[PDB]
Design a protein around this nucleic acid. Structure first.
Lengths: 148, 73
RNA sequence: GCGGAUUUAGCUCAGUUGGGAGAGCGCCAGACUGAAGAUCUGGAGGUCCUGUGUUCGAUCCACAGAAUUCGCACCA
RNA sequence: GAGCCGGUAGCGGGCGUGGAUCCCUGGAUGUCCGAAUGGGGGAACCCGGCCGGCGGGAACGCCGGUCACCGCGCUUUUGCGCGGGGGGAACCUGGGGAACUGAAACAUCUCAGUACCCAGAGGAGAGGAAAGAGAAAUCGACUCCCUGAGUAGCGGCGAGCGAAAGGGGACCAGCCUAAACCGUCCGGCUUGUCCGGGCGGGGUCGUGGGGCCCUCGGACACCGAAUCCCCAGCCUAGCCGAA
RNA sequence: GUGGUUCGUGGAGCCAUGGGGGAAUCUGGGCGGACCACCGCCUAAGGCUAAGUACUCCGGGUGACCGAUAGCGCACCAGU
RNA sequence: GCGUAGGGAAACCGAGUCCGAACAGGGCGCAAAGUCCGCGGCCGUGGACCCGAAACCGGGCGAGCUAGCCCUGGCCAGGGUGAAGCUGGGGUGAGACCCAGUGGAGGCCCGAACCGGUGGGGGAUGCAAACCCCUCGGAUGAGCUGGGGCUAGGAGUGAAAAGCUAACCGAGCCCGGAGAUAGCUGGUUCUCCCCGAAAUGACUUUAGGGUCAGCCUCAGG
RNA sequence: AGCGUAGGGUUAGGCGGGACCUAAGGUGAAGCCGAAAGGCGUAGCCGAAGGGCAGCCGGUUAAUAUUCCGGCCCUUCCCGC
RNA sequence: CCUGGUGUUGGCUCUUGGUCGCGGCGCGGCUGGGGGCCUAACCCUCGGAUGGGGGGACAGCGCUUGGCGGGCAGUUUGACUGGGGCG
RNA sequence: GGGGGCCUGACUGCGAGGCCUGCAAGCCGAGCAGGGGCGAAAGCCGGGCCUAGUGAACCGGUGGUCCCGUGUGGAAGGGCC
């Protein structure tokens, strides 16, 4: 039985799970129900088509987390707020993160990313391992300052 | 004609007849019966060109049913 | 005659570690009885189907014949 | 080419060479039944919508025409426009399909795939360019006649049944489409690359078709029809016609 | 498990199929009579195709064919 | 296509061959050669010397036959017998229960039409393919019935003998297999010449058939 | 002569059948099952001295008659008001 | 008519048997028996609609197995024989 | 016909030539060859003293052949013993 999956087999995993459900068995109860279909070359193309589409959405987004990547890991990270002699009066959040560099420096980037224990403040040079792409990120430099 | 398949015929003929073998494995065989009977499948419900339901049997049924060569479901 | 089932004491049968030949009996006897029966005691019961072979050693393992029994194979 | 109102010869009356009787072919009527079909029904009868004159409607209102069964395609829209079905002596294939009787019984066998019934095509259907035949590396459509052959062979090896290639002959004759490969699109999913159906490519005769790259190459090859008059044959009477 | 075939169960194939499994797209896939090697043939699982053979209701022709109890039974107000 | 060699299961050999390992026999060699045709006595397939039955098998044909069953009407002149009941009276508590009145059932009795058809009479080329005469049973009932229909003939129906199914159903009737087979039965034609039979023996699901012999006849040596 | 030839005879708004109704049963669009022919079969329809429906008495010919005469009794449809 | 395997006759779990391999037990592939509501076929159900309800892997029903089986169908059941038979 | 000695011809290939005979059967048999046994040897031996102890042909088993083998190599299968 060329069972073209679409969810379960234990659950739902509609991921390349062809399983000899068997004759009318798997035939009637599984898809009569509506949960995938049979070989049908059309599909046996359908699965590979969209597994290839998925293949563009990953390596691409790979090429999208590799462009900002290098361009990003080279230049600075300047944000001179106010302060006294250490620390700022309103710490420094990766929230104030985005806002700046973006608008200013330019390219849009998240604010859930960047690996921040808390709201620094120590102004000046203090790098921040910023999680950009799932496997590859950006431990960039950050030089703040109380422009006074 | 209302006892066939739609997706092909298969009804009729059937020249049965039993005997009492006992050959090649020694000596020779014999004869008897002289009857004639039927022999066929079964039918399920479908539909085409505004309702119709269909019928035809297994085999075939497993087919067109899956697909449909003149009307689907 | 194609196949399966088995073979030891008078009868019916156990017997697998390859080394003791065993049980029951029913049968015989003793005890008991007025006797016999019933009970208790005891005893016997040998071509382990035959032959040959294997083995230090054969009821047991190997090789033909057999017999009994059941099913089947029947167009000389 | 000059007689006629049929077989009726009879009474009573009449058409005709300013081409009657009749011979031809194409006509218009074709009452009621019958597949019947508008509806019903014991056939040859009795009943209904639309149009219809308007008709005696003497100062009072009808037949005629019509129309329409149902299964078939499908311009689907509310479906408008095409085919069928009923026949038919014999012959045709399919669908189904038997005892007698022979075997000097009779269960195998035979009569047979006959007789019959059913469906359906035609004027002929049947069949028909080969996953064929056989073995000389030989043959080639199908069919039919002779022959092969009462042979090879089937079998209570009994009664019987009993092929074919090859050779001779009649005839000849070849073609298509799914056949997703290409492009065209139309409709969907839901945008891609899926299935879909109309247009061509090709649309295979004896192994090819596409798609790519260079040689191409630049008019006689008509089929089962399609067509024109042609001799259109016949279609009944055509008409001379030696003494 | 039946068919047809000369094949009546047979050493018994090809083609056709009643039920059940359910391959390949040219070194593919049947075939040449169980099967197997090698050789040889063919390319299926859609379709159309006049002509060559069969049959007389019809019309004609012809008769070592008849003559009214023969011929079709029925030669003429007969399938009555 | 028969003859031109054949011999053999065959391979195959071949005027020789198969058995075999032996010159012992079987088949044949030895040409005598046919072959086609015509005309005949015959033999096989044929319906095939001619008519003859009971039956089997196919497709139709019928409940205005009759047996049923469904639907729907009609029909049983008179009379007789007298159960449930209800009314009243009756010794006990009520009653059982008795009696008397009324009352009117029952596949009930006596009997017409109507349904039938034992028991005798006639009739026997009848009046008639079941009828006439005298006689008899049933006579509100598994009652008789008209009209409408349903079933069906290897199948129906059947208060059931194998009955009835268009006047003889032990499996209807018509057309078809078909002119079934038919050791049995008959039937089997103009003259004349010639000779002249058997009625036994052997084997038969064979004995009143027929194979082979024995006895006939014609052609040549 | 209930035999031959010839001529002639039976008339209905109200009698019967239809122009109304259904049971059996038969048909039968749909629906259901057959190798084919076919089987069944809803609703609707067919189906009768069962249901329903508006008259009777006398006269009058060679024959008819509740129809023809006449005297008496009615019904349904239509148009008008 | 009864009957094994097979089919459109789908899920979930409870289990014992064989087997060969690595009296045994541990495992392992193999495969056999079986017990369960379910349930999406199937069928039936209906009860006022197409939804519900009930059975449910049944069974209907198809294919092969085997069995009963005079209900029916078709044949048969010798000769002799100083009559047919019995003998 | 009664014992004892070794011995098995209780043979293959064949049989001239007859008995009985419609059929098929049935039955006999010198002698020829290969190969033995018994006897010195001349010879006898192809079961019995006989005449009953029986069966067609097909339907098959099996030990031998290496005859056929359905395109050739073979085998299923078949023919012959």
């Amino acid at each position: 039985m060329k069972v073209i999956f679409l969810k379960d087999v234990k659950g739902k995993g509609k991921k390349g799970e062809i399983k000899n459900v068997a004759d009318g068995y798997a035939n009637n109860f599984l898809f009569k129900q509506g949960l995938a279909i049979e070989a049908t070359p059309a599909n046996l193309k359908a699965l590979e088509a969209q597994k290839q589409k998925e293949q563009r959405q990953a390596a691409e987004e790979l090429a999208n987390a590799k462009k900002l990547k290098e361009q990003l890991e080279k230049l600075t990270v300047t944000i001179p707020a106010k302060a006294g002699e250490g620390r700022l009066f309103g710490s420094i959040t990766s929230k104030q993160i985005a806002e700046s560099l973006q608008a200013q420096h330019g390219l849009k980037l998240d604010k859930r990313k960047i690996e921040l224990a808390d709201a620094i403040r120590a102004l000046g040079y203090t790098n921040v391992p910023v999680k950009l792409h799932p496997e590859v990120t950006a431990t960039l430099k950050v030089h703040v300052t109380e422009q006074k | 004609m209302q006892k066939d398949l739609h997706p092909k015929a298969v009804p009729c003929k059937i020249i049965y007849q039993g005997q009492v073998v006992m050959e090649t494995m020694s000596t020779r065989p014999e004869i008897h019966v002289d009857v004639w009977s039927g022999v066929h499948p079964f039918w399920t419900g479908e539909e085409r060109f505004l309702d119709t339901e269909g019928r035809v049997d297994k085999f075939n049924k497993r087919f067109g049913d899956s697909y449909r060569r003149g009307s689907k479901k």
